[PDB]
Structures are given as structure tokens and as C-alpha cells.
Amino acid sequence: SNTQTVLPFTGLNTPNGVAVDSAGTVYVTDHGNNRVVKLAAGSNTQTVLPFTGLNTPNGVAVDSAGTVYVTDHGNNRVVKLAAGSNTQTVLPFTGLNTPNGVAVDSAGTVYVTDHGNNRVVKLAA
Amino acid sequence: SNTQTVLPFTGLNTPNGVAVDSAGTVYVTDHGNNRVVKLAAGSNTQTVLPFTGLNTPNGVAVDSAGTVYVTDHGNNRVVKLAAGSNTQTVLPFTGLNTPNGVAVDSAGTVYVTDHGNNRVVKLAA
């Protein structure tokens, strides 16, 4: 296609990260509003995810289990949110300084760009 | 795991996006050096992808075919490179303003957080 569409998210401010799962559900780090929002394919209502203690999200990824991974700018950490239980787990990375991008491979290994430390770190689940 | 591994990228500056493909190849937007670097799984040396004219790139994604998608933030555009190709393609997005995140679904649809415009746009293959 040569013509984009705009997704019907609302009230975004400086969004900075996006991920999409197998059902076509789109996840966005709404940076300026310190929240993570998702929109199912073909929906008008967006859903704010129950991340807690977030201090400005920088990036997002989603795995095959529907687990959502988010880099937290102000807390220098990476968190994941389990589907269903909505349990939030802080990944035991250490020495991060402004994690930004996050990615997850098929084996569940988590990769993070450590922006303040000029390095890339990975951590198996 | 309580073991994190620093990947053998070198000379990074303010890196800010990471992606990993099905073969375990890792791609990073080395934002401060206007380049995208990659490292094969178990590889000794990073390789710079032959993108042209990148300026403060930020987001990166990779699809199941190994095609690499980069938000070329400083140029308000999204570019992609097929594996082995030496000629990037500028995707026909419209009116982007300081874009950041990019994602790609199984159908090849490309999603971009158009940060400066407080919106998320989508472009089918």
C-alpha cells in the first residue's frame, strides 16, 4: 500500500514505541502521559494496561504469550506484565542507565538498549 | 536468569532501538553515530547495514524474512532493507514528525509511532 491509515488511539502525547501481537492488537508507549495503551484491530476503545510505578515508558515489545515488556526511563528498569494475572515483574537487569528499546526473541530472551551506558544487554527469562 | 550478557557491539553512542530476528541476529539503532549495526548469534564482529543518509535513527524492527525497518527520525521517514540488499526503500508514509517506534506484523503491515504528531500510523504491504 502507498497510503497510510491513522489508528484510532486518543489523547496521546509524544508516543515513542509500538508493538503488535498475532491477533493484530497494537501496543503503544504513550510517553507524555506515562502509560501504555492497547487497541485491538477494528476497535474504537483503547485500553490502558495496568503497569504500576512507571516513570515514563521508552519502549515496548510483546511475546507469543501476550506478555508485554516495557522500558522505564526514570526507574532505569525493564518490566513485564503477564497476561491474565496482570502480575508485573521487574526483570533482574543491573546497572541500567536509561533503558530505551526492548526486544524479545523466540526463546524468551530479553534484549535492551542501555542508552546511557552505550551498550546492549540481554537476559534470558 | 540472573546472568545478563553485554553484547559485543562496539563504539555505540546513545543507542535507542533493538530488534532480534528468528535466527537470533540482533539489530541496534546506534543513534549517535547515524547507523544501524547488527550482530549474528555467536558472532565476533558487528556489521553496519548499508542504509544511506540516516540521521538520528531511533526505532528498529525486523520481520520473519530478515527485512530490517528503521525509523530514520532525523529525516521524518521510515526506511527498509531486505536481507542482502544494498538499496534501501523509503516507505510511502505521509507527513511524519519526529517519528520513533516501528513495528511489523505477520502480514507485513508496518506500524509507526509518529511522535511529533501524537499519533500512530499503519501501512499495509
For residue A16, give the nearest of B68, B34, B70, B99 by alpha carbon.
B99
**In chain A, where are the structural domains located?**
1-125
Helix (H, G, I), strand (E, B) or coil at A89: strand
Asked if A50 contacts A69 with a C-beta cutoff of 8 angstroms, the reply is no
3-state secondary structure string, chain B?
A: CCCEEECCCCCCCCCCCEEECCCCCEEEEEHHHCEEEEECCCCCCCEECCCCCCCCCCCEEECCCCCEEEEEHHHCEEEEECCCCCCCEECCCCCCCCCCCEEECCCCCEEEEEHHHCEEEEECC
Per DSSP, A3 falls in state S
Resolution (A): 1.4
Give the minimum alpha-carbon distance from B13 to chain A in angstroms, rounded to a whole number.
Answer: 5
Residues of A in contact with B104 (CB under 8 A): 20
- Separation CA B107–CA B121 (nearest Å): 16
- Separation CA B21–CA A123 (nearest Å): 16
Query: Considering all CA atoms of chain A, what is the largest pairwise distance in Å, rounded to the nearest integer?
Result: 43
Q: Own/partner pairs for B92-98, CB < 8 Å, 24+ apart?
A: B92/A1, B92/A2, B92/A3, B92/A4, B92/B123, B93/A4, B93/B121, B93/B123, B94/A3, B94/A4, B94/B121, B96/B121, B98/B73
- Interface residue of A100, A104, A109, A121 to substitute, partner B, most B CBs within 10 Å: A100
Experimental method: X-ray
* φ, ψ for residue B34, nearest 5 deg: 50, 40
